Amino acid sequence: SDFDLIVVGSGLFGLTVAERAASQLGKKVLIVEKRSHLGGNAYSEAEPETGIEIHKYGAHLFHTSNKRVWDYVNQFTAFTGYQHRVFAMHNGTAYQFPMGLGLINQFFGRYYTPDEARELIKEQSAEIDSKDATNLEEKAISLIGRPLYEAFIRDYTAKQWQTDPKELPAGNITRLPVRYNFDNRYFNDTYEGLPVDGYAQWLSNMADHENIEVRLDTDWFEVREDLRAQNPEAPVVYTGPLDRYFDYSEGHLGWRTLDFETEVLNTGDFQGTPVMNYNDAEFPYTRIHEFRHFHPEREDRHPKDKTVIMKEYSRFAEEGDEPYYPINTPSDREMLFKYRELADAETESGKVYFGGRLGTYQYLDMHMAIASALSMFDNKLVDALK
Amino acid sequence: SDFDLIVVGSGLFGLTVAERAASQLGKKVLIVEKRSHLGGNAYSEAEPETGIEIHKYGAHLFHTSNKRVWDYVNQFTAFTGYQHRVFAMHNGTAYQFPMGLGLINQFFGRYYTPDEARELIKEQSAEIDSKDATNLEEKAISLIGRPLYEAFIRDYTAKQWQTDPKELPAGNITRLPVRYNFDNRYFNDTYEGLPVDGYAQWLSNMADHENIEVRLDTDWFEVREDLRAQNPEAPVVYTGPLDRYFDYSEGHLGWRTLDFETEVLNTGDFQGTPVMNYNDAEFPYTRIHEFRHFHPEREDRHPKDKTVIMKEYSRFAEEGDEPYYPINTPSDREMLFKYRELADAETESGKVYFGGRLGTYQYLDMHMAIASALSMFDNKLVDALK
Ligand SMILES: Cc1cc2c(cc1C)N(C[C@H](O)[C@H](O)[C@H](O)COP(=O)(O)OP(=O)(O)OC[C@H]1O[C@@H](n3cnc4c(N)ncnc43)[C@H](O)[C@@H]1O)c1[nH]c(=O)[nH]c(=O)c1N2
Ligand SMILES: Cc1cc2c(cc1C)N(C[C@H](O)[C@H](O)[C@H](O)COP(=O)(O)OP(=O)(O)OC[C@H]1O[C@@H](n3cnc4c(N)ncnc43)[C@H](O)[C@@H]1O)c1[nH]c(=O)[nH]c(=O)c1N2
Ligand SMILES: CC(=O)N[C@H]1[C@@H](OP(=O)(O)OP(=O)(O)OC[C@H]2O[C@@H](n3ccc(=O)[nH]c3=O)[C@H](O)[C@@H]2O)O[C@H](CO)[C@H](O)[C@@H]1O
Ligand SMILES: CC(=O)N[C@H]1[C@@H](OP(=O)(O)OP(=O)(O)OC[C@H]2O[C@@H](n3ccc(=O)[nH]c3=O)[C@H](O)[C@@H]2O)O[C@H](CO)[C@H](O)[C@@H]1O
Ligand code: NA
Ligand code: NA
Structure with a gap:
């Protein structure tokens, strides 16, 4: 044959x-x-x-x-x-990400030792207990508390799913999204x-x-x-x-789909990091990728004064719209x-x-x-x- | 033979x-x-x-x-x-280190784009020009300005050399210690x-x-x-x-010498990072090493509840004192x-x-x-x- x-x-x-x-x-x-x-x-x-x-x-x-x-x-x-490393933008500040001693310091005002932060989270999160949570907003707060949930999860999640988190299965958070060290490998x-x-x-x-x-x-x-x-x-x-x-x-x-807005800017460097998450609702997109940073080993074959960035938008997939994520x-x-x-x-x-x-x-x-x-x-x- | x-x-x-x-x-x-x-x-x-x-x-x-x-x-x-990565302790906050968009954000209050930070440094540092600097304090300020110099260099340097920086050769800083990105590989x-x-x-x-x-x-x-x-x-x-x-x-x-104070603490994790620099004068030591973090790949052969740390002190070498760094x-x-x-x-x-x-x-x-x-x-x- x-x-x-x-x-x-x-x-x-x-x-x-x-x-x-x-x-x-x-x-x-x-x-x-x-x-x-x-x-x-x-x-x-x-x-x-x-x-x-x-x-x-x-x-x-x-x-x-x-x-x-x-x-x-x-x-x-x-x-x-x-x-891979990620930074999270909230109220005009780039926060270390994911949630760990790094973010905790920047957000709560001073340094917490690993033990100090475990304790911090214990209080912050003791409002709701994780077995009595009904939707996503609850389940999150039950794990990390309101100040963190509202600053780093609420709008971000709502953007990604086009939905109020109170209207989402509590089953979507399964473990503690917090590190009690400074390790920010994604x-x-x-x-x-x-x-x-x-x-x-x-x-x-x-x-x-x-x-x-x-x-x-x-x-x-x-x-x-x-x-x-x-x-x-x-x-x-x-x-x-x-x-x-x-x-x-x-x-x-x-399916859920994604829309990508891709600009060439006339700067050598727009955010000085591969990915910047945007967590506040006042921005339509969830994050911005600046692709030159994905391959710094090439910088001498990269334009010294231009950089390609790309903003990521999320919504539900209609006809012809590329399928990306299953909804379920x-x-x-x-x-x-x-x-x-x-x-x-x-x-x-x-x-x-x-x-x-x-x-x-x-x-x-x-x-x-x-x-x-x-x-x-x-x-x-x-x-x-x- | x-x-x-x-x-x-x-x-x-x-x-x-x-x-x-x-x-x-x-x-x-x-x-x-x-x-x-x-x-x-x-x-x-x-x-x-x-x-x-x-x-x-x-x-x-x-x-x-x-x-x-x-x-x-x-x-x-x-x-x-x-x-290797290093964090720098100053006024009760662990700062990202070395000096880059990370530190700049935490210290000056909000996020600066790479271009925004170059400009920030241009102003901050335009007080003294680098060719008219006489000692170390001057040469530093001429490169990064007073707010940064005084917060992250002044006491740290003085501790390491047992000397006021005004009394040090301007030749000891040769380039800009600042990164205009978020890359904190040491x-x-x-x-x-x-x-x-x-x-x-x-x-x-x-x-x-x-x-x-x-x-x-x-x-x-x-x-x-x-x-x-x-x-x-x-x-x-x-x-x-x-x-x-x-x-x-x-x-x-x-020679300059080093004194090492080595404690076993009854915690699994004391600072959640290999090295923490201490930049304020109110601490005798320059930095603390927590050695378990040097080899995280071993954590299941590491005590779950004790950790060995070690504080580093600096002074001039007398007889029998180990020679570490040449003075010149x-x-x-x-x-x-x-x-x-x-x-x-x-x-x-x-x-x-x-x-x-x-x-x-x-x-x-x-x-x-x-x-x-x-x-x-x-x-x-x-x-x-x-
Ligand atoms: C937004 C986003 C971001 C990421 C990722 C996914 C998504 C959606 N991925 C996951 C990655 O995309 C995924 O693993 C691969 O797409 C899976 O390859 P497949 O072969 O399954 O399908 P895939 O969709 O890639 O291949 C199917 C192919 O079949 C073709 N085709 C369809 N219908 C056809 C037809 N009728 N006749 C002929 N050809 C047809 C399509 O055109 C397509 O080329 C990822 N993973 C990871 O590990 N790390 C990451 O960082 C990411 N990032
Ligand atoms: C505080 C500090 C921290 C670091 C470092 C240095 C210092 C001072 N190093 C540098 C590293 O220590 C250095 O490269 C090596 O010590 C150099 O090895 P040597 O063979 O030159 O001398 P070294 O001093 O190591 O070896 C000399 C040996 O000769 C012995 N000896 C002396 N007199 C003798 C005699 N009369 N008879 C017999 N034996 C005698 C001594 O006892 C010693 O064992 C480092 N480098 C790096 O790349 N990364 C790092 O992170 C560090 N960290
Ligand atoms: C590029 C890619 O393939 N991404 C997928 C991958 O990880 P990703 O790291 O890309 O995850 P993601 O950033 O898209 O976020 C996953 C979820 O975490 C929460 N969140 C995340 C980031 C943030 O700043 N704030 C916040 O609240 C939020 O509820 C979100 O829905 O696997 C995830 C499941 O674990 C999802 O399938 C992601 O779509
Ligand atoms: C462990 C080791 O071998 N260290 C040596 C190595 O780098 P190190 O990275 O260990 O350098 P270091 O932290 O000892 O500092 C070097 C100099 O940088 C300045 N500084 C540093 C850190 C900080 O938080 N603030 C600050 O102001 C200060 O002027 C100091 O004298 O090479 C240096 C020369 O480049 C010195 O020879 C260091 O002793
Ligand atoms: Na709880
Ligand atoms: Na200058």
Whole structure:
């Protein structure tokens, strides 16, 4: 045949399935991608004026404690020593973030020893007890108290979800968001970095295999009947939207979307840090990314006087609006449940597997998606190709 | 012979000379050390109560941009990903450090954009111009202005040198100590970490060679006549005090010393950060080190309820007081100059080379000393042993 496997979508999930089939089973793999580029939402490209790498589907920071995933991805790219850090803007002051001795000092007026801060939090938060909380505002206050909740969580959360926090499931805060030290690494994971030559270069390296064919600008649904005809029981990994596959025959799955406002400013440096969160309601956006700071190791190939920034806005996804985050109203998880048995059927019906964030309606970090793909490869696909 | 080279001292300098001679030239090397342990001032050991590694000759943070040195030392040990950061205590508040957008925000009351802060510094510092400054207080103010100078430099400097800053050479500040971003990595070097199994283990690995013999608890001057007798033109690398070698026949070289007050507290965490600088005069010490934070990767082998801290005090070195930092009064650098031709003579006289911080009266970072040793090995010793 000309191919042994078809992969719909070229995000990390599809790519990982592809690469494994090509390199490990030596099979011929056709990848079909709807967009103009490889990569799915992890894709980055250079802003034209400055040459600075930007991510057009949201900033992507890579981090894992899964050694298997880490060793895997380093096959395709090297990473930088970048450690992610975030600052939080509130009442004209950039606060250290997340909540720890750093923020506590700036906000409450003086230094608290680690023990002093535990005690501080005990009082501040003893108003509501965590088992008698009903919504999100309560659950938060019950954990960290009102002054902190109202300054660093209330408006930020409301912006991100377009909703009053009193109207949100108390289940959305599960642990204490406070550190009793000065450690402000954003992520707690073993391995962390950015792809040295950017995401696009990395993603491309995954598909660069003598057994992998890629057709960009190709909707699966327009060419499925044709391609399956050419080799009828080559199996398919589908990583497109799950509900769309079954023609919304059980209703439209609810996503949150993001709008990105991207300016080139005529300064070398706009905030002197990769990400600045904006926590007060008087700003429409949740945060601003200044991308040159994501790769300081390149500063001598960066414009000395311009910088590309990008403001992030959040709202509910309508038609054509990119799906980013699943919403998961209970009136969402029920039509999921029905689609999963539709799919399971379709998997034993027509050898079509469903994976990745769109095809399972699930938020996945990059390492999570890659792990998910590697799982499906080893447990489902190795058998499906012999 | 029983040895081909004698090395006086087992600090990084001596060790590096030793290892190179043993492994590269295959020579027999006798190392003579006065103290009870290997390592010189880089030596660390476990505090007995807690088991936490402490450095008894001052905290040692390893950092370099010299690839040669870095590749070398990794022969003998692995490093952690530790990145050094420092906070500065002033008027009951822990400030982000060094001076950058972080500190500027906390101290001046609100956030300054990078451009906003450059401008802020331009005004603040325009009082004195840097070419018309006479002492240290002036030179500092001329660069960053009075409010900052007086809050973060004045008392700190005076503590460290036991002197009013007006009475200090203006030459001691050479560049702008300010960052116009939020980056608070303490060191700007390519490579940085702590030895994974501690310094002692590292230092020991260097001397662990089938060609290297080590005699601890042995003063060179007590055994020189005897050992040189056994092989009379085996050469000597001397890394002990330079003036003491020549029996202070040109006067006593002036050092600053350090006093270390080391307590075990009954808390798991005393300041929640490796190092806290104390900048106000109302505290005798310059800073406090809390050593468990130097190695967070070990926290499950660290006492959950005790922590070893250590306060650092500074004054001028009298007899027997450990020499740490050279003072370099002009009435110090002149008796140096005389000792260097004494030594150069002694080198062509009796094949005795002088190296390392004590034998050259020079502050050396660890990578600097190692580089210095590797230089002397390649340029002086390879010829001296054929
Ligand atoms: C805003 C935001 C920010 C981040 C992140 C996500 C989001 C939403 N990520 C997560 C990351 O984006 C995620 O792990 C990957 O998108 C998952 O790759 P997938 O293969 O699952 O889907 P993905 O959506 O990337 O790939 C699917 C591909 O299939 C294509 N396709 C769809 N329908 C098709 C059809 N009918 N025919 C053909 N092609 C079709 C799409 O065009 C797309 O290229 C992240 N993770 C992390 O670890 N750290 C981070 O910092 C971030 N940041
Ligand atoms: C307070 C402080 C703090 C730091 C540092 C220094 C100081 C003073 N260091 C620098 C580091 O200590 C320095 O690089 C090494 O001490 C240099 O090793 P040497 O071989 O030159 O001398 P070092 O003094 O270490 O070795 C000399 C040895 O010779 C022995 N000796 C002396 N006379 C003798 C005799 N007569 N006979 C036999 N033996 C004799 C001594 O007992 C000692 O063991 C540092 N650097 C860095 O990169 N990062 C850091 O964070 C720090 N921190
Ligand atoms: C870029 C990306 O993939 N982001 C996702 C990732 O972490 P992120 O670190 O990007 O999380 P986020 O900043 O988007 O915030 C997550 C939640 O934390 C709260 N919050 C956060 C920041 C702040 O300044 N104040 C505040 O209150 C708020 O309730 C918010 O909904 O995983 C999260 C789950 O843990 C969410 O899925 C995020 O969308
Ligand atoms: C542990 C160690 O080996 N330290 C040495 C190392 O850097 P260190 O980072 O340890 O420097 P340090 O903190 O001892 O300070 C160096 C100088 O900077 C000024 N200062 C520093 C900190 C602060 O909070 N406020 C302030 O004013 C002050 O004038 C002081 O004399 O190299 C320095 C030279 O660059 C000195 O040789 C230090 O002794
Ligand atoms: Na509570
Ligand atoms: Na000036």
